[PDB]
Amino acid sequence: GIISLLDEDEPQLKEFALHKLNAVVNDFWAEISESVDKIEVLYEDEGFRSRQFAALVASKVFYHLGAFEESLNYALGAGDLFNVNDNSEYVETIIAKCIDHYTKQCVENADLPEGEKKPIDQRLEGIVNKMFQRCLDDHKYKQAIGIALETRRLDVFEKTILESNDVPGMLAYSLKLCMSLMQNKQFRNKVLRVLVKIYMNLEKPDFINVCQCLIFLDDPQAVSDILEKLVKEDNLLMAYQICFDLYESASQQFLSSVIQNLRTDQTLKMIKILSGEMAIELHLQF
Amino acid sequence: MSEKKQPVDEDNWDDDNVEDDFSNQLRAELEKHGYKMETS
């Protein structure tokens, strides 16, 4: 009956007509299903005062009809009036398809880096850092890091590991993830080398990092730098162990490449154990 | 199985087939059916 108010042509009746739209849109579902063209009308005016609200209640009524992309495209035209509301079962279902549409978009965009990509909304990452604001309220950042792997975006992956200080081991746990369920190898090294950036920002180097990363990334100068660091702070305990692990794990021509970067004492110590002769005859001894 | 819409619910032994077709049309069948012949 308030579509009769939508027929008349003054603005101060419109805003009290649309205020009554979303108030009873949950109970008077199919009445608006015929007045769809009137709203998508009222929407197309650039002189209309609440056109972004018309995209909200259109997204409400296509949500009833099951037209999910029509609620999606009008959530794009909704502005900040949509995402300022966040505690509903309505809002979480059509941002679910929004993440779903976006994460299948970037996998398609990862196939063609040379231009020819798509124009993209920016509230879809305005809810990402909002979810990070929830994770700031949560202390549990394992959930925002999940989409951060899925979204193929790595600066938010760096922002969430340069977060409010709670463990380096959480990042190590994320690194496991890269050993078990990581499928592609094209961006795997990028994830695997942005982990060793924050490791060089971190105070202690690990074992399983270079046991995973640098044999999958074959940088012989990088382990020759970080072990020279382990020489530099006089730490011959863990430099001694990672050479035996590297001699067991890695392959030919990479041990030959790193031993060139050695000479580029404890130096003659790591000549003999990266040649790895003494490990063989003690293994022959057993 | 209650469906919540229930709450109300030769004598004439095969009568309604006879009654829906013929009801009460002088069933002795002689006073007009056998007695047309006075007209001719």
Partner: protein, 48 residues
């Protein structure tokens, strides 16, 4: 609610998503072993 606001926000997204992913894996396993036994009949015919 440190966890309660987020169990509906960033965990209700996942656990509702894995629900139907659990249903179809449940569904195809009933479908697969049916296909298994139907193949075991025809192989028992041809080998005999």
């Amino acid at each position: 609610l440190e966890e309660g606001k987020a169990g509906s926000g960033l965990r209700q997204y996942y656990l509702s998503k894995i629900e139907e992913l659990q249903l179809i894996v449940n569904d195809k396993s009933q479908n697969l072993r049916r296909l298994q036994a139907q193949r075991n009949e025809l192989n028992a015919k041809v080998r005999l």
